[PDB]
Amino acid sequence: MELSFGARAELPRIHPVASKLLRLMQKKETNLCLSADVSLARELLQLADALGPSICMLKTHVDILNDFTLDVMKELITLAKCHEFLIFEDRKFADIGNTVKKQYEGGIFKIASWADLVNAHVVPGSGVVKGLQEVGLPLHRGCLLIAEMSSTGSLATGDYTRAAVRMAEEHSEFVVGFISGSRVSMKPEFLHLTPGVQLEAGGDNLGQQYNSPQEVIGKRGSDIIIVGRGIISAADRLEAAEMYRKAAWEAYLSRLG
Amino acid sequence: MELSFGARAELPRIHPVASKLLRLMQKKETNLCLSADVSLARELLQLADALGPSICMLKTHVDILNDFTLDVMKELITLAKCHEFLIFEDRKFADIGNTVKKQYEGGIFKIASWADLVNAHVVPGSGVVKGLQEVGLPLHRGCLLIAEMSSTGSLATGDYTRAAVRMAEEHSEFVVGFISGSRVSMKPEFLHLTPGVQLEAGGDNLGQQYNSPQEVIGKRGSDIIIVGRGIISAADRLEAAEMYRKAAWEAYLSRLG
Ligand SMILES: O=c1[nH]c(=O)c2[nH+]cn([C@@H]3O[C@H](COP(=O)(O)O)[C@@H](O)[C@H]3O)c2[nH]1
Ligand SMILES: O=c1[nH]c(=O)c2[nH+]cn([C@@H]3O[C@H](COP(=O)(O)O)[C@@H](O)[C@H]3O)c2[nH]1
Ligand code: PRO
Ligand code: PRO
């Protein structure tokens, strides 16, 4: 009784942001999230424009953009609306609730004003979610909880992962899913997004480890692949994005049967 | 064989940043870190100037400063040098190594350029430290690892805390200590800094829980108290800082015997 993305978008308990995402995934035949890990606004925007049709989501690290301004994020929103993808700021909120609400709403980045999705580590306990949701619920935003990590030595295992799932399922008015290496929740309303993905085997020299789209979508049951360098470092980033999209989409179709 | 702060500053394996901190703690009779949780640069700087003589450290959240510029941080450095305190950016790095090195060096905040200390969560595994130290070692900086958290539901317990201690003790050329609620390492070269501190019992409505300076320095064996609202929300922040300084300093003296 695995449902398609389009049917999951209609589930009774679906969050509106998840529904919007699932609908555009189905419409565009993409379950690829581009990790736009660049330092220049122009490169960010040129990638978003060219790759927008191929992606369901663009994941940012706003704090590595040397020339960040709120206008850049307005331009990114225009592209997200045009090409139909969500913006996910990979901020990894990880503080007490009182602090994260200010980090989400305020400062120079004003993340909540432009990010459809953010993520949080669960290590502080559920106050991290409660603090974020005070800003994010009124702004109709969603959050992803980090249930597992791709890096060598990750401590997000075992009871830690189980705690992340419980925290999500108790905050389902705001939490729409997980960053994880596999399916961690059996509830189909929750999205599973998986980083540490490349077509070829390997890793990096700072603890990143890679698995293929077929492995993480098809065997491990995740929904969306998050891909940075496998695309970004390629010469033709559009063709690279298409190869990752086709890989992740077929793996989804073949699991769905 | 508990050593004074001044003697710890001379230990063979001490990190230079820890040594500088311990020396100024001893000189100024302060083991108070102000958590300068404000949104205005002028308030940040006015607090740093007035409270500088009373503190060993000023902890920032640069990402909640509505009017951040690098010039503000230059002015903060002037005050830190004048009054003799270290600047700790409480960024809670918590990503893979390749990402955190860019978040530490780059973007609009250029944290490594002005922060003596930063901190990191250990959940990604030791690549988080390796990535930071690539930037921080050449810049003669130090890092604190989050071994425990003060908030309700914290998952930084048990084997997670032990993993943080091991990670610190294997990266001692860069890691100078811990954020923790108590002493977690028996090695006197490592600093223990404890948030969740107020003179009165209680908490906040988003999971913060408080213990007193006497409890965390005197019974729990920590070195430094980190205090935000207990000072910041008081009318006279200078007198409040002095009350916290005297509390933490006496608790240290009485444990030292
Ligand atoms: O929440 C997360 N949990 C993880 O386990 C994880 N692994 C990688 N990352 C982030 O994803 C991107 C990976 O980029 P690459 O494809 O270039 O290695 C980069 O932007 C990384 O910061 C993670 N984020
Ligand atoms: O690394 C950390 N581990 C913790 O357990 C913890 N508890 C509180 N905080 C931070 O410290 C400050 C506490 O501020 P208050 O005194 O106002 O509650 C605020 O700036 C908080 O962000 C922590 N940081
Ligand atoms: O028509 C559609 O696209 C959706 C998919 C599931 C049922 N209705
Ligand atoms: O003279 C001092 O201040 C240091 C303290 C320990 C021994 N020497």
Counted across chains A and B, CB pairs separated by less than 8 A come out at: 172
Asked if B34 contacts B241 with a C-beta cutoff of 8 angstroms, the reply is: yes
A84's CB contacts (< 8 A; 6+ apart) are: A24, A27, A28, A52
Contact in structure between A118 and A140 (CB atoms under 8 Å): no
Question: Using CA atoms, how far apart are residues B156 and B147, in angstroms rounded to an integer?
Answer: 6
Q: What is the resolution of this structure in A?
A: 1.0
Residues of chain B positioned with their CB less than 8 A from the CB of A64: 99, 102-103, 106-107
E strands, A110-167, in order: 117-121, 142-146
Extract the tokens encoding A242: 């298409």
Query: Which ligand sits closest to the CA of A182?
Result: 1
What's the one-letter identity of residue A253? L
C-beta atoms of A151 and B39 within 8 A: no
| 3-state DSSP assignment of residue A4 | coil
C-alpha B237 chain-centroid distance? 19
Q: Quick one: tokens of A195?
A: 């980083």
Does A96 contact B65 at a Cβ distance shorter than 8 Å? Answer: no
Contact indicator for B31, B249 with CB cutoff of 8 Å = yes
In Å, what is the CA distance from A169 to each residue of A55, A115, A193, A213, B154?
27, 22, 16, 26, 17
Q: How many domains does chain B have?
A: 1
Domain of A211? 5-252
Q: Which residues contact A189 (CB under 8 A, 6 or more apart)?
A: A8, A11, A13, A14, A15, A18, A172
* CA–CA gap between residue B88 and residue A3 (Å, rounded): 49
Would you state the structure tokens that stand for residue B211, as one six-digit string? 């213990």
Solved with:
X-ray
Q: How far apart are the first and last CA of chain A?
A: 11
Give domain status of residue A114, yes or no: yes
Cβ-proximal residues to B236 (8 Å cutoff; 6+ apart), any chain: none
Tokens of A164: 């992340």
How is A72-125 classified by DSSP, letter by letter?
Answer: HHHHHHHHHHHHT-EEEEEEEE-S-HHHHHHHHH-TTT-HHHH-SEEEEESTT-
**Closest to B33 measured CA to CA, from B17, B20, B21:** B21
C-alpha–C-alpha distance, residues A134 and B209, integer Å: 19
Which residues of A are less than 8 Å from B152 in CB distance?
A: 125-127
Structural domain contains residue A122: yes
Asked whether the beta carbons of B37 and B256 are under 8 A apart, the reply is no
A151 to B124: CB separation less than 8 angstroms, yes or no:
yes
Do B103 and A109 contact (CB within 8 A), yes or no? no
Q: In whole angstroms, give the CA distance from residue B224 to residue B147.
A: 15
Are the CB atoms for B183 and B222 separated by under 8 Å? Answer: yes
Ligand 3 neighbour A3 (Cβ under 6 A): no
Residue B97 burial (10 A CB sphere; 0-12, 13-18, 19+): buried
Full 3-state SS string of B78-133? HHHHHHCCEEEEEEEECCCHHHHHHHHHCCCCCHHHHCCEEEEECCCCCHHHHHHH
Place of tokens 């030791």: B126
Token digits of residue B135: 């930037």
Assign residue B239 the CATH number of its domain: 3.20.20.70
3-state class of B33 per DSSP? Answer: strand
Q: Classify residue B40 by its DSSP letter.
A: -
Is A95 marked active-site?
yes
CA A114, A129, B87, B98 torsion: positive or negative? negative
Ligand with smallest separation from the Cα of A180: 1
B83 Cβ contact list (under 8 Å, min separation 6): B48, B49, B52, B53, B55
CB-based contact A36:A60 (threshold 8 Å): yes
Compare all CA atoms of chain B with the CA of A149 and give the residue at the minimum distance. B124
> Distance from the CA of B105 to the center of ligand 3, in angstroms?
47
Three-state DSSP state, B60 = strand
Task: Give CA–CA dist B88/B58, Å, rounded.
Answer: 6
H helix or E strand, kind and range, residue A50: helix A41-51
**Domain-embedded: residue A97:** yes
Total H helices, total E strands in chain A: 11, 8
C-alpha span between B139 and B104 (Å, rounded)? 11
Q: Which two tokens stand for residue B223?
A: 């070195």
Of A68, A126, A130, the CB nearest to B107: A68
Is residue A257 one of the residues assigned to a domain?
A: no
Let me know if residue A71 belongs to a domain. Answer: yes
On whether the CB atoms of residues B110 and B140 are closer than 8 A, the answer is no
Note whether A103 contacts B131, CB cutoff 8 Å: no
Number of CB atoms found within 10 A of residue A93's CB: 25
Element (H, E) at B244: helix B237-256
DSSP one-letter code for A12: T
